[PDB]
Amino acid sequence: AKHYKNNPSLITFLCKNCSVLACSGEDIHVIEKMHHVNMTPEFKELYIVRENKALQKKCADYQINGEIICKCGQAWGTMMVHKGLDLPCLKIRNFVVVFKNNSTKKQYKKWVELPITFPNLDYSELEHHHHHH
Ligand SMILES: [Zn+2]
């Protein structure tokens, strides 16, 4: 991570199945150094939440209430909820990542494999973040 670029605007995420633009890297936050989410209102117009009892569960710091999928049907991630706040969690394996100016397409299995550093919000910062921003 020390040689990563802390410039998320360099990348865009496309659904690996239908190629639709899911979001810019600028719309991603990492939560408690683990979960990569997109909490913007615009992103909510692009996914559907469906039931998936294999993935739903109650955790100490969040609950998983469903699976997030693209309008085309391709799974994208999970719907986490922390203290009533929605955390749409993206699994990088469901997307194609495009880097600007070089426009080269890439696929990854884990977020740590993508050499980009994103802004972090610990769980303890979420209520404040949603109240103000
Ligand atoms: Zn799709």
From Swiss-Prot:
Cystine residue pairs: none
Cellular location(s): Cytoplasm; Nucleus; Mitochondrion
Domain spans labelled RLR CTR: 1-125
Post-translational modification: Sumoylated. Sumoylation positively regulates its role in type I interferon induction and is enhanced by PIAS2-beta.
Binding site for Zn(2+): 15, 18, 70, 72
Tissue-wise expression: Widely expressed, at a low level. Expression is detected at slightly highest levels in placenta, pancreas and spleen and at barely levels in detectable brain, testis and lung.
Induction, per UniProt: By interferon (IFN) and TNF.
Note: In HIV-1 infected HeLa-CD4 cells, overexpression of IFIH1 results in a great increase in the level of secreted viral p24 protein.
Role description: Innate immune receptor which acts as a cytoplasmic sensor of viral nucleic acids and plays a major role in sensing viral infection and in the activation of a cascade of antiviral responses including the induction of type I interferons and pro-inflammatory cytokines. Its ligands include mRNA lacking 2'-O-methylation at their 5' cap and long-dsRNA (>1 kb in length).
Binding partners and assembly: Monomer in the absence of ligands and homodimerizes in the presence of dsRNA ligands. Can assemble into helical or linear polymeric filaments on long dsRNA. Interacts with MAVS/IPS1. Interacts (via the CARD domains) with TKFC, the interaction is inhibited by viral infection. Interacts with PCBP2. Interacts with NLRC5. Interacts with PIAS2-beta. Interacts with DDX60. Interacts with ANKRD17. Interacts with IKBKE. Interacts with ATG5 and ATG12, either as ATG5 and ATG12 monomers or as ATG12-ATG5 conjugates. Interacts with ZCCHC3; leading to activate IFIH1/MDA5. Interacts with RNF123.
Family per similarity comment: Belongs to the helicase family. RLR subfamily.
Involvement in disorder: Type 1 diabetes mellitus 19: A multifactorial disorder of glucose homeostasis that is characterized by susceptibility to ketoacidosis in the absence of insulin therapy. Clinical features are polydipsia, polyphagia and polyuria which result from hyperglycemia-induced osmotic diuresis and secondary thirst. These derangements result in long-term complications that affect the eyes, kidneys, nerves, and blood vessels.
Name of the protein this chain belongs to: Interferon-induced helicase C domain-containing protein 1
Gene from which this protein is expressed: IFIH1
Parent-protein start and end of this portion: 893 to 1017 of 1025
